[PDB]
Amino acid sequence: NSDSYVLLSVEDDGSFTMIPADKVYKFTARNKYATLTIDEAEKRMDKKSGEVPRWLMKHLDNIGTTTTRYDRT
């Protein structure tokens, strides 16, 4: 409903500005926790195990592969 919305801000002098809002964007945080990747993900989700390892991501982090973006920086 980006069309039906419309903006009204009080300014510093008390001016009430009149903006017809055009579009809305929703933002989600991403890779805050060192996400895994596609190929080893496929070997994980393939039906080779009765259950995948419970602490598999923690074990991969302890091995050191697939660090966070902040850690790479």
Place this chain on the structure above:
Amino acid sequence: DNDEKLIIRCRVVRPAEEDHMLKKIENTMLENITLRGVENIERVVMMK
């Protein structure tokens, strides 16, 4: 058999991850252990 609650205590002996092994084990427990009676016979009733 004289208690007011009937419990079976069981643990795996071992010479991580034990949750899903115990899940699979108890699933097999529930399914496949015959107790008495011949298979392919279900609830049996008796008439007069």
Place this chain on the structure above:
Amino acid sequence: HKLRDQVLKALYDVLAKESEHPPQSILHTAKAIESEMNKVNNCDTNEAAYKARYRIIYSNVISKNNPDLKHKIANGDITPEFLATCDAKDLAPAPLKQKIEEIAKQNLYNAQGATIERSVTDRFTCGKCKEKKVSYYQLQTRSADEPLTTFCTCEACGNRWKFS
């Protein structure tokens, strides 16, 4: 003899743990040893059923419910009979016993199944026995141009016939 002394140790422990702490310690350990010999009078460390009966009696003493069994065994309950009881379903305690018979009665009721009973009349006679206890049914089988079937079922002997 290790099993002998272990059962003796357990028995001395559970009778010393009783509310009636018996000053007749030698008499109650005599009760313990005579229960040991009458217990091993079954198998004497030859079969695991000895251990099973041991579990039965040991946990019956422990249970609480019931506690009064400790005083009753301390002041009676001649144990050579209690080798040959096997009779844990009729002891410790009576309310659980009453629960057991009502459970068994309900199970026996639920075992025996459907008993549909074939409501009757008295107009026709049997095709074979020739008596009037006749029971029927209605439905129509063939095409629409004709009425019902008028099923018959005798009950004096169980005969079936039909009328058009």
Place this chain on the structure above:
Amino acid sequence: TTFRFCRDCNNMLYPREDKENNRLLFECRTCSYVEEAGSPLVYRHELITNIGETAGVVQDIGSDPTLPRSDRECPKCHSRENVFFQSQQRRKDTSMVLFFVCLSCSHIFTSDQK
């Protein structure tokens, strides 16, 4: 038996074991947040279900017409109006229990005679 999600990132904490102090660390797997659980109970099955007979009590049941009406009293308000209906949990195995709800006290009560 309920699920506790990681507060830092909305994913349910998983059971994992202290290898030395022997405690229930509900750890997040998405991030590294960890949490100590309360009871050793983790998994729970309930092979036999017998619940659901009073389902869907909305605040305005009386607005429907098709519910019948009777004359028993609410044993909180004693108003003579009430609404009753069959048990909701439709199994082949359920009962003829009637659940009476009164509009006045907005209160439910049954008519079991055990």
